[PDB]
């Protein structure tokens, strides 16, 4: 019923992960962010905090981890199109030239979502960056499956 209670509960599971000397993995953070996509409005500050904690721990954000932050910051059913967020530009700068490998089950989803956000913003310069990232190394393998390859 209450998000604040719900969020504090999930955090309690994380606090018991340190009491038992259990270190989190990439999937742990990806799972938390995938859950946050429900509360677009209130999940923005929590979601960014997770990614900062991911780097400090030493876990490297994968394509799936950004796929979830984009959904949470650029809703498809977004009435407030007047002033969209600029995070997509920073993400692409962060990932410029990096090569990625399969490390999660949502890595394929990232590219299809990134192009969609480019079409919504009508920025063709950003679309070139996204496609340019797809061509570096063997990133082409994470474009997506049959449903998401033709959408991209």
């Amino acid at each position: 019923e209450k998000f604040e209670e719900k969020w504090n509960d999930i955090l309690d599971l994380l606090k018991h992960m340190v009491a038992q000397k259990v270190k989190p993995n990439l999937q742990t953070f990806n799972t938390i962010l995938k859950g946050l996509r429900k509360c677009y409005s209130l999940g923005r500050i929590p979601a960014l905090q997770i990614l900062r904690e991911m780097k400090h721990i030493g876990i490297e954000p994968s394509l799936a981890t950004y796929h979830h932050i984009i959904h949470l910051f650029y809703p498809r059913d977004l009435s407030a199109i007047k002033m969209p967020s600029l995070i997509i530009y920073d993400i692409m700068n962060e990932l410029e030239g990096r090569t990625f490998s399969p490390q999660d089950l949502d890595d394929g989803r990232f590219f299809q979502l990134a192009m969609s956000v480019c079409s919504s913003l009508r920025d063709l310069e950003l679309a070139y960056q996204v496609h340019r990232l797809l061509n570096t190394g063997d990133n082409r393998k994470l474009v997506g499956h049959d449903p998401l390859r033709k959408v991209y």
């Binding site: 030239g97 090569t99 061509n135 570096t136």
Partner: protein, 140 residues
Amino acid sequence: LHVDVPKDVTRPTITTSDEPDTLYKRLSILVKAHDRAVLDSYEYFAVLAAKELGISIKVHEPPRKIERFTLLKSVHIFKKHRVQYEMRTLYRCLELKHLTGSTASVYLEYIQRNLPEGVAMEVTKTQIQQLPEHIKEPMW
């Protein structure tokens, strides 16, 4: 591709070891085929490939072999009437010189993977090594 080009193509990992490398004084590659034209095209591909990697190469044509045998033309009797068949083997020898063991593996793979159908190779590596440490010093 006109506008869409790979950006940073991935390249295989080549790690230099600490083991010393083999030294091949000579490396004779005898290709065999029923067709002379195929050997001419393969000889051009192999000589061009060697020259592009810095390898020293020479080519000569060993004499061809023709194996002929006779068979009985009829199914029954008619002994004196026969049919003869032959198989022709043609050779092209690519004699390489002064190759390290890494250069001989990459070259042989590249040319062996591109060996046309109907062509057989016979590589004859000739390694050069020092004397055995025991033999170096006479011990009674």
